[PDB]
Structures are given as C-alpha cells and as structure tokens.
Ligand binder design. Structure first.
Ligand code: EQJ
Ligand code: EQJ
Lengths: 368, 368
C-alpha cells in the first residue's frame, strides 16, 4: 500500500508471484554447479583474506559488463548488503551538504523515498527531457545532485553514452554530483559501454551504485557496490563504516563465481531467456483491445503493460482473486502517481511456465 | 580513526585479529554438517514460501534464548540484513518525533553514531545509574527514547528483570520509547528471562533489536531482528520497507539450523568455549603489574582489559608493531572518550590458538 515494496510483500509466498523484480527463475546447470560447491566456497572464505575475494568479485563483475575503468584501488568500491543500503548511505551522505536532487521520473520508488526520508527535496526529470536535451542551467544551479537510474526501472530506458557524457560535463560545470543506479546494467548491452571512463574523463563528482541482485537467482544473496569519485566530497565512507564492517566473503565468492559463469555464456543465455519471457507476455496480450506495451524496446527483466478503461489497481485486484500477484505502477511515478494509473508491471525473471499461467490469467481478466 | 569500525578495518585481513566482535572461531562438527548441506538448504529455500522459513527461524532463535513471549504474528519481527541496518531504521524512525535519546554509556559506538547521524541528541546514562536506581523524572521527561544495550558491549553487564520492568514502567508513564539492543543475548543466561513478557506487561512503547551475528561463525551470514510494540507509533515498518523486501531465505534457513544445533547442546558448548577463552586471557595476564579486569562476571564474547600506566591506545600501537590488532576503548565512551583511554577490548570469538598467540604478545608488552 504505502510503496511498491508493500505491494510486493503480498506476492512473496504465492506461486504466481510476478511482482517483485528479483530473479526467481530456475538455476542453469552451470549455476547449480556453483551451488553444489558452496561448502568448498565456505572453506575458501574461511581461509583467504576477504580483500582478495572481494577484489576478485569486483573484477569479475565489472569486467563482465564492460566497466573496465572502474577504480580497483581498495576501497573505492564499497560492498554493501544491498543496493538499497548503498542508496541509504548515499542519501544520508547527500543530506550533509545538498538540499535538492533532480531525479529521473518514473523510477523505482524507494530511490525517491530514501532520498526524501533523509530530508532531500526532489525535482522530477521526465525521461524525454533527460535523454533528449541538456538539462537547464536553472535546474543544475538549484540542485546538488542529478540521479539517474539506467537502465531505468520500470522503463528499461538506457542513458546513451553521448548523453551520459554531456550530463557529466554539465554536472562538472556546476559542481553538482552525478549519481547513477545501474542495478539493471547486466540486462542490456546498450548499458555496457564503459561508464567510468566517461565519468572520469568528464571530471564531475560522481557516485555509481551497482547491484548484483536482479540478475541471477541467488536467493537474494547479493551486494550493492557503491562506487564514488575521489573528489566526491560527501561522507559516504564514514557513513558506510557506521553501518557495516563489510559483507560476507561467501557472498563475494558467489558473486565471483556467478560472474565467471556469466562471462562463459551465462549472460547471453540470460538475455535470450528474458527475451523469450518478454515475447511470452506480449504474445499472450496479443490483440487484446485496449492493451499496449509502453516500452517496446525494453530489455529489462520487468515489463510494463498498459490498458484503457481500467486502473492498474483494479487489474491487480482482479488478478489477485486468481492468486496472481503483479504490481500497480502508480508509485513508480513518485512525483505524479496518476501518471501510472493505467499500468501494471510484470516480473520476467521467472520460470516461463508460472509466468505463462499468470499472463493467461491476465488475458482472461483483460477481457471482462 | 573516525570510529571503532575504522579501527576494525585495519585488522580485517590479519592473522592475529582480536579486534571486531564477530564470530571467527572454527565451526563445530554439528555446524560444519549444516554447512555441508547448504545445497539442500538452497533447494528448500527455492521450494518453500519464505514466510514459513522465517517463522521457523524466528521461533527457533527466540525459544533458544528464553524469549517465548515474542510477537509471532507475521510482520511483527522484521528480518534485516544486520542489526546495524535495524539500528539505522530505528534511528531514522525516531528522528521525526524525538530530539533526544538517553543512551547507556559506554556502549558500542555505531549505536551513538547512527543516532547522531540521524539528527538525534544523546544523553549518556552511566551503567551504575542505569542498573542501580530508577531514572530521574527530569531525565525521562526530557528524552523521547531510552536505549539500553543488554548484555552491554563492551562491559557484558546484563539488565536484570526487575530493573527492566521498572524501566519499562517508567518509560510508559512518561510516554517514552524504550529500545533494547540484545545482540549479545545468546552469551549470557542472565539475559534469557522473557524480555517480551515484561515489556508487554509494562505497556510502554518498545523496540528490541535482536541479532544472530555475534553467536556463530557464519561468515557474517546473519540477520538483525527488529521487533516492535503494536503501539510503537514510529515509522519502523515503512522505513524497513523502503530499505528491503526481506532477507535471503537461505540465511533464514541457516539461522534456523544453527539455532537448532544450539538447542541440541551447541549453546552450552559455546558458553564453555567462550569461558575457556576468557580464562585463557585472564590467566595469561593474572600477574602482570597494573593489569585488572573491570567486568569479572561478564560472559560476553568481548573482554575488557584495564591497565595503569599507559593508554589503551599506546598499548594498541605496541601490539600493532607485533601484528596483533585489538581495539582502544576510548570510543566506547561516546560521551567522554577519556573515560576509556586506560583500557583495550579483546575479541574472544576466536580459535584458541590465535587468541593464545595474541594474548601472549600482550602479556609480553605489558611486562616490558
Ligand atoms: C533500480 C533499482 N535500484 C535499486 C534497487 C534495490 O534493490 P534491493 O531490493 O536493495 O536488492 C532496486 C530494486 N527494485 C525491486 C524491489 C526491491 C525490493 N524493495 C526494496 N528494496 N525497498 C523491484 O523493482 O521489484 C531497483 O529496481
Ligand atoms: C551491541 C551491538 N549491536 C549491534 C552491532 C552491529 O552489528 P553488525 O556489524 O551490524 O553485525 C554491534 C557490533 N559489534 C561488533 C562489530 C562492529 C562492526 N561495525 C559496524 N557494524 N558498523 C563489534 O563490537 O566489534 C554491537 O556490538
């Protein structure tokens, strides 16, 4: 009710959960071999310095996704329990010296709520403005930080390299912090150009929150990776250290192993699997008059579906009576929820059969 | 440097780390059997509703430690990545409506730093005042929350049932939130009377932060458990849900299994192990001139050593020269750091060989 996560609680124990964006599909054979070796990874984690495991996990993950220029010095990458924990750290860090943040709209709502809960005033930037033109000098001088989710959740829209470059330059020209949430990076190769090369070359203050969680079905074993420019000028390291000593070496080793499996062909398979599931959904809502797909080009692991004549809340209630749990979209539009009134979001990181069943139910529903 | 956690980073990749209080001893045979069956726990975590696993982990852990009255209704116990995340949620939840918190002094320093970081003013309450007498009406009426760590870290002092009852009654009559951090509960049977029974009977608004992390050597796989009265009147549920959907079911299953091993005899083995390691430290230093132990009755996994004639931080430097990492105590006295510059803290949740190595260095240093 109060936010998207509270809608997601309702799905957590149902077999037709198509709500939260976490990866819940079956493990691949290669991934299952990693799970089978957990006691070997446990022993390794008992015996090696955590710094070496962590360094190996960062190198595997960043290189996997083309981020070759990431700062590999310890500790320029802070490994957090989750990217939301990274976001809480950044948010509270920003509130030490910033009053206002320009934020892409729509986006996942806990980004807005963590920023707002830490006392920051939010200025929405619609995706068209963000991708299509320079930000206004008026905007950039009224905010201390521009925050971009890319690929965006829920739209899948990717900030292209030329636009990231121009944005980083505008932020440098105004001294404003450029912050990126790249949680969905792994799903779309358009997001695999080297973002850190661009940022370092522009010379702006910057933070990037990476996330290993949404990509592989690891039972929510994950890290958020909070990466910050040398001159970030915010107390991210101090506040990080108030919250944690570090993450489990076993999780870091799991990230290392899953990244290597991904580099050896798992990532291509993941892209094919997500594309298959997206087609399942779009074929199932084939003709269905009134139905449309707002993000024709998205390659993300979540999928928006729009409809005329119904609200997403009504669709959600009709769906739930059949034990199918999706997500109304109102709350992604954190500055104007009515923008989301006629959409639901569907999770594609699911085994195809339960997904198929859920969308067949949505098809029936979406025909009164 | 800036807090105790930053002192703890220095030891993290070192063979003679006796600094942080995390459990780093070897798995028992029963515990290693659990680790060997991780692939089975993984399969269980994929197949069963997380809610069932979580309820089972909570029941196992609360009943293990005497807390039979805990609220077992789903949603009343909020499983967090760590008790520090629980603490961040609580601190932010307090910041809207509370200006000042009465906080036991000394205590672990990120408790103070997370409260201060979220805008709360702190009022120290020395242990002897806290345990030995009712709090003044003047203090209680000037403060929105009383926060007590029991068993305390670093002293191991346990809030007795009679005092908890009176303290909860006093907070109820002044409209004050009583908050307990009970992360060290499992080490001291003196803390295994049912805290939830007395909290509910007194009828104050309350929060308890439980923690599984310090008890067992699980490579930091753990949960903080944030528990709250129905009338708590703070946004703990909302801010929780801003931060996370939930913890890994695999970690929940692990907690359940380690709690069951502990109920089968592992807890007694742990108490005997910790007592052994404390005995090692105290026998090693019994005769050194100027050396004392301020907490003779502590059963905690951390041990305070006091010494005349040198600063806890000079002793820290000498031990470092010999590749031994403990902690200076100044920063536990978060309101008056000089109260602790003649003590260090030693970590006991360690294998006995490296602990014995570490304490032999300390004897030698304190003799020269
Ligand atoms: C763009 C973006 N950046 C960070 C995160 C945090 O990921 P985390 O959960 O910390 O691992 C998300 C997660 N979105 C999930 C729901 C997460 C569960 N709810 C909360 N975390 N409050 C979804 O879209 O369903 C994200 O989309
Ligand atoms: C009484 C009490 N309550 C909560 C926590 C948080 O436990 P967590 O680390 O979240 O699992 C602690 C931590 N005790 C350890 C580790 C400090 C690590 N540094 C940070 N956490 N910032 C110690 O005393 O060395 C505690 O003593």
């Amino acid at each position: 009710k109060e936010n998207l996560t509270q809608w997601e609680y309702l799905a957590l124990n149902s077999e037709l959960n198509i709500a939260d964006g976490h990866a819940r599909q079956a493990l691949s054979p290669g991934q299952q071999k990693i799970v089978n070796e957990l006691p070997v990874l446990w022993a390794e984690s008992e015996q090696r310095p955590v710094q070496q495991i962590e360094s190996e996990a960062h190198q595997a993950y960043f290189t996997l996704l083309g981020q070759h220029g990431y700062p590999a010095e310890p500790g320029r990458v802070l490994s957090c329990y989750s990217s939301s924990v990274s976001m809480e750290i950044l948010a509270r860090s920003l509130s030490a010296s910033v009053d206002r943040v320009a934020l892409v709209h729509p986006t996942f709502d806990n980004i807005a709520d963590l920023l707002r809960g830490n006392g920051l005033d939010l200025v929405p930037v619609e995706e068209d403005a963000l991708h299509g033109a320079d930000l206004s000098a008026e905007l950039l001088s009224s905010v201390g930080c521009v925050f971009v989710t890319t690929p965006n959740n829920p739209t899948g829209r990717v900030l292209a390299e030329e636009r990231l470059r121009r944005l980083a330059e505008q932020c440098a020209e105004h001294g404003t912090v450029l912050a990126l949430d790249t949680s969905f990076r792994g799903f779309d190769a358009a997001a695999h150009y080297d973002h850190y090369a661009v940022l370092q070359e522009a010379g702006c203050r910057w933070v990037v929150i990476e996330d290993t969680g949404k990509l592989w079905p690891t039972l929510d074993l994950k890290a958020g990776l909070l990466v910050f420019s040398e001159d970030i000028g915010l107390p991210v390291e101090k506040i990080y250290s108030d919250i944690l000593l570090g993450v489990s070496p076993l999780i870091l080793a799991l990230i290392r192993e899953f990244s290597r499996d991904a580099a050896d062909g798992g990532l291509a398979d993941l892209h094919a699997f997500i594309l298959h599931n997206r087609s399942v959904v779009r074929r199932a809502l084939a003709g269905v008059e009134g139905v449309s797909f707002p993000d024709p080009e998205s390659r993300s692991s979540v999928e928006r579906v729009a409809f005329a004549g119904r609200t997403g809340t009504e669709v959600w209630e009709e769906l739930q009576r059949h034990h199918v749990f999706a997500l109304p979209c109102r709350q992604f539009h954190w500055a104007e929820p009515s923008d989301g009134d006629h959409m639901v979001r569907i999770a594609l990181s699911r085994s195809t059969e339960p997904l198929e069943k859920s969308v067949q139910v949505l098809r029936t529903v979406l025909e009164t």
